[PDB]
Amino acid sequence: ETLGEKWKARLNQMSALEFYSYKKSGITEVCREEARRALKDGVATGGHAVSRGSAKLRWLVERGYLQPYGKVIDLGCGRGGWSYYAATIRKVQEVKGYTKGGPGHEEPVLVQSYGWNIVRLKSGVDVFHMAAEPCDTLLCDIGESSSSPEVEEARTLRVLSMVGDWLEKRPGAFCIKVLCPYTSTMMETLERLQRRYGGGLVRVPLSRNSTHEMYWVSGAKSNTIKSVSTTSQLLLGRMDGPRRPVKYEEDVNLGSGTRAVVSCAEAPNMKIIGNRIERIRSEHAETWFFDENHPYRTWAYHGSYEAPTQGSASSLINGVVRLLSKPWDVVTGVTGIAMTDTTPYGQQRVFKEKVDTRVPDPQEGTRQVMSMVSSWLWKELGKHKRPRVCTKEEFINKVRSNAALGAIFEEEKEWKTAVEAVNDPRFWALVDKEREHHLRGECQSCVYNMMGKREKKQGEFGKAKGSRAIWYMWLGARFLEFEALGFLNEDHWMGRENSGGGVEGLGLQRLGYVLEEMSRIPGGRMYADDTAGWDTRISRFDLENEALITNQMEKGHRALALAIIKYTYQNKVVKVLRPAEKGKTVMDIISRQDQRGSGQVVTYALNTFTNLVVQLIRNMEAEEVLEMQDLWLLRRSEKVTNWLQSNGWDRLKRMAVSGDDCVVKPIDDRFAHALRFLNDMGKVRKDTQEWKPSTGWDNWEEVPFCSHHFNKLHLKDGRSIVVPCRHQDELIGRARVSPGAGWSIRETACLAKSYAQMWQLLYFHRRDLRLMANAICSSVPVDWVPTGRTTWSIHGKGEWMTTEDMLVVWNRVWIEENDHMEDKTPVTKWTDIPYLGKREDLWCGSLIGHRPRTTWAENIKNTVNMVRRIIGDEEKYMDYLST
Numbered sequence: 001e002t003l004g005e006k007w008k009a010r011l012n013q014m015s016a017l018e019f020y021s022y023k024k025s026g027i028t029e030v031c032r033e034e035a036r037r038a039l040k041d042g043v044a045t046g047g048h049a050v051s052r053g054s055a056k057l058r059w060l061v062e063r064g065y066l067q068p069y070g071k072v073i074d075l076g077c078g079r080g081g082w083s084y085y086a087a088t089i090r091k092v093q094e095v096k097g098y099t100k101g102g103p104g105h106e107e108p109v110l111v112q113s114y115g116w117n118i119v120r121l122k123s124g125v126d127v128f129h130m131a132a133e134p135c136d137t138l139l140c141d142i143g144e145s146s147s148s149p150e151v152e153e154a155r156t157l158r159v160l161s162m163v164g165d166w167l168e169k170r171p172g173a174f175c176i177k178v179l180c181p182y183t184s185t186m187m188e189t190l191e192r193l194q195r196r197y198g199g200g201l202v203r204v205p206l207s208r209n210s211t212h213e214m215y216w217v218s219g220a221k222s223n224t225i226k227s228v229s230t231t232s233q234l235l236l237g238r239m240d241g242p243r244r245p246v247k248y249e250e251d252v253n254l255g256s257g258t259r260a261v262v263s264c265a266e267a268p269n270m271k272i273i274g275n276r277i278e279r280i281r282s283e284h285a286e287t288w289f290f291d292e293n294h295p296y297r298t299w300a301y302h303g304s305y306e307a308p309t310q311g312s313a314s315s316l317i318n319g320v321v322r323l324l325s326k327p328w329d330v331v332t333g334v335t336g337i338a339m340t341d342t343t344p345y346g347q348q349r350v351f352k353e354k355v356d357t358r359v360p361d362p363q364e365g366t367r368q369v370m371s372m373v374s375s376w377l378w379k380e381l382g383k384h385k386r387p388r389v390c391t392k393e394e395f396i397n398k399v400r401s402n403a404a405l406g407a408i409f410e411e412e413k414e415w416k417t418a419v420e421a422v423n424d425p426r427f428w429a430l431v432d433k434e435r436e437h438h439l440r441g442e443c444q445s446c447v448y449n450m451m452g453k454r455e456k457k458q459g460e461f462g463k464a465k466g467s468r469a470i471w472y473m474w475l476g477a478r479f480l481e482f483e484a485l486g487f488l489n490e491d492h493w494m495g496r497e498n499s500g501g502g503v504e505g506l507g508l509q510r511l512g513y514v515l516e517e518m519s520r521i522p523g524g525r526m527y528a529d530d531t532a533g534w535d536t537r538i539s540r541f542d543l544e545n546e547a548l549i550t551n552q553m554e555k556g557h558r559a560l561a562l563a564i565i566k567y568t569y570q571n572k573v574v575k576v577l578r579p580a581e582k583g584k585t586v587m588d589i590i591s592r593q594d595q596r597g598s599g600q601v602v603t604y605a606l607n608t609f610t611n612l613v614v615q616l617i618r619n620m621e622a623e624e625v626l627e628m629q630d631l632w633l634l635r636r637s638e639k640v641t642n643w644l645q646s647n648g649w650d651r652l653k654r655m656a657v658s659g660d661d662c663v664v665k666p667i668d669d670r671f672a673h674a675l676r677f678l679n680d681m682g683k684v685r686k687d688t689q690e691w692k693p694s695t696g697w698d699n700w701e702e703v704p705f706c707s708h709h710f711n712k713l714h715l716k717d718g719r720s721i722v723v724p725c726r727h728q729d730e731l732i733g734r735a736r737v738s739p740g741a742g743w744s745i746r747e748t749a750c751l752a753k754s755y756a757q758m759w760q761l762l763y764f765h766r767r768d769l770r771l772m773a774n775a776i777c778s779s780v781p782v783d784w785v786p787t788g789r790t791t792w793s794i795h796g797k798g799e800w801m802t803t804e805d806m807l808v809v810w811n812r813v814w815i816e817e818n819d820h821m822e823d824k825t826p827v828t829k830w831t832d833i834p835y836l837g838k839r840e841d842l843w844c845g846s847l848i849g850h851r852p853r854t855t856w857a858e859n860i861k862n863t864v865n866m867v868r869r870i871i872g873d874e875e876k877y878m879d880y881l882s883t
């Protein structure tokens with residue numbers, strides 16, 4: 001029929017050697033060796049093109065067929081070379097990149113090409129089911145080649161059927177891949193759409209002679225049949241006669257580093273922080289400089305200096321656990337788990353999106369409601385207990401050796417560990433200086449340090465997951481914090497006794513009893529919806545509400561505490577690690593006046609507090625106390641305190657919140673759609689439409705809280721206990737990981753023990769965790785001491801970190817100290833303790849009944865004896881496996 005069709009049939013008639021001769025003949029290419037080495041190495045700061053695509057778009061823009069700007073959207077990014085080139089162009093502002101990825105060779109790559117700070121990529125996106133969005137520039141490289149023109153047509157048509165929905169929303173420019181433009185159905189539709197929306201079709205010489213792929217672009221106006229049949233003609237004429245020589249061109253150099261952006265941050269009160277700033281400058285005045293290409297939007301850029309790189313991403317294996325769990329080598333849910341990327345890159349590529357936000361300033365009515373509820377809560381909390389200053393001796397009483405130092409200034413760089421510094425009165429002399437300055441109204445040293453947290457998390461793109469930001473101040477400042485507001489934690493102000501809704505310090509054993517007590521309480525359903533990135537969502541007004549406690553202190557206590565709040569919380573100065581161009585790395589200093597840090601002493605206290613305030617507010621809105629106008633301004637504010645004193649405790653005891661996480665039990669289902677105040681404050685719901693009603697639950701056993709759902713188990717003798725559970729795969733993955741670089745096998749086995757006894761203590765009800773844990777404790781010498789860190793939760797006291805035997809500890813925590821258990825009868829043997837229900841065990845991630853688990857379980861003894869051999873013989877093992 002058409003020129004393209006006959007050319008295609010002829011191409012398929014060919015054999016392998018003619019295929020070879022033709023496919024490359026006389027096209028243009030780029031020297032890809034320079035890049036393809038850096039890809040194998042992973043040299044991010046090389047600034048090379050991750051795919052060929054970058055050269056394609058480059059040729060498209062240099063000739064002038066595409067004029068991109070503003071909000072750019074890449075469809076089918078793949079590695080992402082399109083997006084990465086997009087970043088470079090003068091007029092672009094935001095680059096989002098979407099592709100399918102996953103199984104098969106089809107994933108993305110993360111590098112440090114110029115302007116990477118505006119490149120937000122994502123995987124696992126069937127864009128056909130994705131609703132469109134209003135771009136300024138639309139890009140699409142989608143279209144799988146094939147032999148059958150039926151396919152090329154079918155697909156390319158489907159692609160267009162998708163992209164139409166987007167294009168109708170008016171992009172300033174566009175480029176779309178068209179695999180088959182040479183068929184009659186194709187030619188017709190392409191002419192119709194060229195008329196209806198514009199642009200024109202251009203064939204690129206970079207593309208190989210083995211496909212008819214053409215690109216539909218904004219800046220052109222050529223007729224379909226013209227360029228299409230010109231391309232077909234050139235392809236045919238290239239087929240016959242001479243194999244013409246490939247032409248070599250230089251691949252584009254993207255550069256490296258960050259790009260400048262619109263600084264929308266509030267101006268800092270230089271009187272407060274200027275001392276710290278100019279002190280830091282005066283200390284690092286040798287290499288101090290100001291980069292114009294700061295990547296910060298919502299923080300005040302205060303400067304940078306040259307520094308060395310900290311942390312890494314590499315993830316090591318605990319061969320103990322892995323060799324004791326070969327059947328789990330298949331599950332992605334465990335293998336994909338790895339370390340967090342704590343490099344400056346891995347930090348900043350989370351910072352720029354999660355942390356670089358400025359919360360919507362809530363309205364004056366919501367402000368008034370917040371301050372009222374916060375005042376009432378400070379009243380009802382400080383009734384029984386009163387504030388007090390904490391003493392040095394309490395600080396050194398609580399302190400341990402492992403705590404973080406925080407080397408900032410030259411005067412602070414003497415000591416090595418905490419236990420050393422605390423015993424040197426020079427330390428306390430500097431503390432007395434910063435205290436005298438604080439009382440005088442100046443701050444010289446309370447500066448925040450920040451880096452990426454060493455966590456065990458699900459890997460993304462088959463690669464290291466990014467590290468969330470953690471920031472804390474140096475020891476002395478933490479002491480000032482402790483003596484000022486140290487007590488709220490110490491006296492257990494958030495304890496269920498005093499608070500009612502809080503659960504400060506209570507372990508994972510108990511919390512399910514709180515959920516049972518809450519379920520016996522009548523009403524509607526249970527709602528536990530996670531608040532997205534709580535730390536960033538804390539606003540000025542919330543901090544001013546939390547500072548209201550100062551009215552219950554005394555003159556000195558109020559002076560020190562309020563001073564610390566003002567010069568520490570309400571104005572924050574941070575030191576952060578950023579990777580610079582050409583491989584070097586630098587330290588930036590920034591500031592802001594909002595949100596909260598993970599390393600603030602009263603993190604849990606303030607978080608739990610303001611979270612309770614939020615839940616109270618939403619309970620008022622749900623029960624028709626707050627009308628829709630009262631966001632703008634409050635009507636008849638007294639009917640707030642009328643409700644608070646009528647049912648406050650009555651509703652507060654219907655709460656179980658812990659820092660960021662929350663559990664609520666309201667009177668009726670209106671709580672599911674009382675989102676207006678919640679949203680106005682800026683406390684959005686994670687992974688849910690902002691305006692869609694919340695998911696509730698009937699059966700309390702299924703409630704997720706602090707990552708765990710709590711199940712009730714009856715003992716074989718008759719008594720009932722409440723146990724925490726979650727998905728097996730996450731725990732097995734966590735055990736697999738080894739945190740340190742270059743650790744001797746001893747300490748890794750120590751970690752394996754720690755995890756084993758953790759599972760025995762808590763997740764005994766899980767057949768695979770009990771089995772595997774007994775296998776670890778068996779294969780590990782019972783001599784050795786458990787070391788390391790297993791979970792970062794505060795509700796794990798660390799009861800498994802001892803040489804004791806776990807039956808006795810189990811009896812202590814689950815029977816002897818169990819407040820909700822009346823009969824104190826200890827249990828004699830392991831097999832009296834029941835497992836979880838077989839169906840529920842299967843659901844929570846168990847592999848019982850499958851043949852790899854049966855094989856591994858029946859040959860457990862051979863493998864464990866192999867572990868004993870590998871460690872080393874003539875060491876004392878105990879054979880825990882009796883059954």
Ligand SMILES: [Zn+2]
Nearest residue numbers: 443444445446
């Ligand atoms: Zn200070």
Ligand SMILES: [Zn+2]
Nearest residue numbers: 711725726844
């Ligand atoms: Zn479960």
